[PDB]
Amino acid sequence: PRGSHMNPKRIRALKSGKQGDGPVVYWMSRDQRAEDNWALLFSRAIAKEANVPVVVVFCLTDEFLEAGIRQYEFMLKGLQELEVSLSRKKIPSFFLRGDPGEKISRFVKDYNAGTLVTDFSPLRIKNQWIEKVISGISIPFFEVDAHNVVPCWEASQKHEYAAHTFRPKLYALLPEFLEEFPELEPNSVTPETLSDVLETGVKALLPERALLKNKDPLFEPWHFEPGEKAAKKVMESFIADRLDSYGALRNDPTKNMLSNLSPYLHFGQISSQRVVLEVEKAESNPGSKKAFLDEILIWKEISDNFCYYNPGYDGFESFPSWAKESLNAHRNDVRSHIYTLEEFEAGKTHDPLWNASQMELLSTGKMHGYTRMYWAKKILEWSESPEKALEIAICLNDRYELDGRDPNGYAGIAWSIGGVHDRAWGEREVTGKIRYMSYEGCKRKFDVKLYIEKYS
DNA sequence: CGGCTCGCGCA
DNA sequence: TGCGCGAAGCCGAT
Ligand SMILES: Cc1cc2nc3c(=O)[nH]c(=O)nc-3n(C[C@H](O)[C@H](O)[C@H](O)COP(=O)(O)OP(=O)(O)OC[C@H]3O[C@@H](n4cnc5c(N)ncnc54)[C@H](O)[C@@H]3O)c2cc1C
């Protein structure tokens, strides 16, 4: 409804009804940013057509107890900057604590909202909140895909087996959906503390903090500055300094040649469409430009496709039949080593390369992309069962990665353990036909000793 | 039937 | 280091 630079294919109606006379309320969950936000822009256009103001509601759930301080501070500090950014545009931001299924419905009734808009996320918990909200509200409810360049329900209607099947589909719809972002218009009609919730949450997560021998924290919070503004600087530095050499050095953990955009992209502090727009105009190495675009467009959005069309995305049942049969037949194979969650967590294994990868995960919260494959695949090799390996890999990924609890993580773990979006390889013990990685293979691609010595 | 985001031999 | 084969099941264009 309404909009000249707005594609209607980015919005879908979750619930029909009579449009109320109150303000249009935007339920911000995934895209925590002010600029290049389709969901916020569409909420403004609906408000403009109805001559009502637009407001933003963020519901703080109990999910931060499962995660750590590193994710809590990163999200909270970005929200504090976001509050000022919306305030400059005369857009009020309301922060609620509790279950969104009950808090959002209460806010709609109390604030007398006219229309409700929310961003899209294929996670299981989001669909549970939406269904609860729908039964408690009586105004139209819309969903906007502000995370993907091409809407998830529009790119493909089925689960995609491999990237080479999804690649032609995505690139065919690029000329339509890849476009510039109109500026956010400030509100014409004007009508909890973020510091207190930060202090309250931190005290609850203090006992669960990872520590060293001398009770010293392992996490180093100066590597990534949270916030919308800092994410712009990371993109600018990557395009100017790192994008040219990305194609040749993205598989070398000893070189900081990655975009470092996943923590910002996970919380929606920067738009992946915005990154694509600046990358496309950038005149750099054609090989590196193609390599980076294949990651942020295909592999990032196919991860949303995997979780959207597979409700068991974090389970063994989502694996392909060939992988399940191979893993089933190799259940009784004697493992070379057996490690529990705690031994994996502290990095007390016989592999010095695996332990160094974990320390980078512990200290920085963002382990290098190449070593994540080795990190996850060796968990399967040294665990009781494939279910145990999937349980440990998901737990350590969500607990310590800044980009954890993301569709890119569940798809990545399933790729490493269950061969999702992959193919069969040579037959092996324990791991069967799942793709294999060895220490000697990494030794021939990068300086392993430098990586190991960098992280003890 | 062609071709997919590893190890390994060889220059 | 970069290149080409090997080992493996299956989708998708016909
Ligand atoms: C076992 C495992 C677990 C992972 N855990 C997570 C996670 O929790 N959260 C997360 O966001 N990513 C995860 N990834 C994906 C990938 O490792 C990260 O996106 C990347 O390492 C982050 O560094 P970067 O963005 O600087 O790398 P870049 O090469 O600069 O990545 C560019 C962008 O493309 C996307 N992308 C790149 N590689 C992948 C990939 N393999 N799968 C999906 N999208 C990709 C991301 O949006 C990323 O920001 C995981 C991968 C594996 C193998």
How many Cα atoms sit within 13 Å of A180 on the Cβ side? 5
CA angle A368, A374, A376 (to 5 degrees): 95
A78 and A12 assigned to the same domain:
yes
Long-range CB pairs of A424-429 (<8 Å, 24+ gap) are A424/A322, A424/A323, A424/A326, A429/A330, A429/A333
Ligand 1: distance of its center to the CA of A292 in Å? 11
Do residues A193 and A74 share a domain?
no
Indicate if A73 and A135 belong to the same structural domain: yes
Distance of CA A375 to the CA centre of its chain: 19
Among A36, A33, A41, residue whose Cα is nearest residue A4: A41
Give the integer Cα–Cα distance in Å for A120 and A428. 40
Boundary-marking domain end, from A128, A146, A164 = A146
**Could you tell me if A120 and A151 lie in one domain?**
no
Sheet holding A141-144, edge to edge: A11-15, A141-144, A115-119, A24-27, A54-60, A93-97
Q: Are residues A355 and A391 in the same domain?
A: yes
* Structure determined via: X-ray
Q: Which residues contact A316 (CB under 8 A, 6 or more apart)?
A: A324, A327, A386, A387, A390, A418
* Together in a domain, A3 and A139: yes
- What are the φ/ψ torsions at residue A228 (nearest 5 degrees)? -65, -40
Judgement on whether residues A151 and A297 belong to the same structural domain of the protein: yes
Which of A315, A333, A363 corresponds to the end of one domain? Answer: A315
**Residue at a domain's end among A146, A176, A208:** A146
b (16+ CB within 10 A) / e for A130-142: bebbbeebebbbb
Q: How many structural domains comprise chain A? A: 3
Is the CB atom of residue A423 positioned under 7 angstroms from any atom of strand B?
yes
Same domain, A84 and A174: no
Q: CA-to-C1' distance for A321 and C10, Å?
A: 11
Pocket test for ligand 1, best of A262, A306, A422 (most atoms within 8 A of CB): A262
Looking at the fold, whether A137 and A224 belong to one and the same domain comes out as: no
CB A270 within 8 A of CB A33: yes
**Do A242 and A278 share a structural domain?**
yes
CB atoms within 10 A of CB A172: 11
Tokens of A237: 């530095």
Residues at CB less than 6 angstroms from ligand 1? A 250, 258-262, 265-266, 295-296, 299-300, 303, 369, 372-373, 376, 397, 401, 403-404, 406, 408-409, 411-413, 416
Handedness of CA A379, A380, A382, A385 (dihedral sign): positive
**In chain C, which nucleotides are within 7 Å of a protein Cβ?**
1-2, 6-13
Q: At what angle do helices A286-293 and A272-281 cross, to 10 degrees?
A: 170
* Same domain membership, residue A64 and residue A39: yes
Same structural domain, A339 and A307: no
Enumerate the nucleotides of strand B whose atoms come under 7 Å of any protein CB.
3-9
* A60, A61, A64, A66 alpha-carbon torsion, rounded to 10°: 180
The 3-state secondary structure of chain A reads CCCCCCCHHHEEEEECCCCCCCCEEEECCCCCCCCCCHHHHHHHHHHHHHCCCEEEEEEECHHHHCCCHHHHHHHHHHHHHHHHHHHHCCCCEEEEECCHHHHHHHHHHHHCCCEEEEECCCCHHHHHHHHHHHHHCCCCEEEECCCCCCCHHHHCCCCCCCHHHHHHHHHHCHHHHCCCCCCCCCCCCCCCCHHHHHHHHHHHHCCCCCECCCCCECCCCCCCCCCHHHHHHHHHHHHHHHCCCHHHHCCCCCCCCCCCCHHHHHCCCCCHHHHHHHHHHCCCCHHHHHHHHHHHHHHHHHHHHHHHHCCCCCCHHHCCHHHHHHHHHCCCCCCCCCCCHHHHHHCCCCCHHHHHHHHHHHHHCCCCHHHHHHHHHHHHHCCCCHHHHHHHHHHHHHHHCCCCCCHHHHHHHHHHHHCCCCCCCCCCCCCCCCCCCCHHHHHCCCCHHHHHHHCC
Q: Kindly state the tokens that stand for A433.
A: 């036909």
Ligand 1, atom 20: closest residue by C-alpha: A369
For residue A296 the two structure tokens come to 């942020």
Domain limits at A202?
147-315
A40 vs A35: CA distance, rounded Å: 9
